[PDB]
Structures are given as C-alpha cells and as structure tokens.
Design a protein around this ligand. Structure first.
Ligand SMILES: *[C@@H]1O[C@H](CO)[C@@H](O[C@@H]2O[C@H](CO)[C@@H](O)[C@H](O)[C@H]2NC(C)=O)[C@H](O)[C@H]1NC(C)=O
Lengths: 49, 49
C-alpha cells in the first residue's frame, strides 16, 4: 500500500512534467481575464462615429 | 526629456514623459502607435531622433 502510493505520486510528477493541457482550467481563467483587458484596450482605437 | 510635460509635436498635442527611443523609424513615418491607437513614439522635427 505504501509502494502503490509512492509509485502513484511518482506518476503525478511524470504527468505534470510531460503534458501541456492538464492545468487548462487555470490557464483558461488567466486567458479570459487577459483577453478581456486586451479587448478593452483595443476598443480605445474605435471611432464610434 | 525624462520629465512630465505638455508636449506638442507638429500639432500632436498631449501630456507625457519623453525619453530616447531605440525604435528605428523608416523615413516616411513621424509617429508610432499603440494597441489603443494613441501615439507612443515620435520623431522630433528639428533633430530627427
Ligand atoms: C532645424 O534646424 C537644423 C539646424 O539648426 C537643421 O539641421 C541641420 O542640417 C544640416 C544638414 O544635414 C547639418 O549640417 C546641421 O548640423 C543641422 N543642424 C544642427 C543644429 O546641427 C534642420 O534641417 C532644421 N529642420 C528642418 C526640418 O529642416
């Protein structure tokens, strides 16, 4: 049971070391808040008539 | 330079701090713009830096 937990924590390191998209839930929340400020900055360039 | 001022370059009125750029404007351009369409660099009309 200790060997299986120690082996399974070793796979957490290997997974996080390997794959790009896993933390997508947090990066998507950064990307929305950054895209919303970038859209608000681009809207200063508009003439509005 | 390096002080807050009410500038005017060729009628481009504004307020800001002027510093020596390392942006290399091709001869046909007097101004550089930002994402917000505001001027963020300018070529001085008497000494062409
Ligand atoms: C603004 O004035 C300066 C001179 O006061 C003009 O620049 C001169 O240009 C000649 C030819 O390259 C150089 O021999 C001089 O050394 C430059 N002047 C200075 C002060 O060093 C400039 O042409 C004027 N502005 C415009 C738009 O013509």
């Amino acid at each position: 049971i200790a060997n299986q937990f120690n082996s399974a924590i070793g796979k957490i390191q290997d997974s996080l070391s390997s794959t790009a998209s896993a933390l997508g839930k947090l990066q998507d929340v950064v990307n929305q808040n950054a895209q919303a400020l970038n859209t608000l900055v681009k809207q200063l360039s508009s003439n509005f008539g | 330079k390096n002080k807050c001022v009410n500038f005017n370059f060729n009628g481009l009125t504004g307020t800001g701090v002027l510093t020596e750029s390392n942006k290399k404007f091709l001869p046909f351009q007097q101004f550089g713009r930002d994402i917000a369409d505001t001027t963020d660099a300018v070529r001085d009309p008497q000494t062409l830096e």
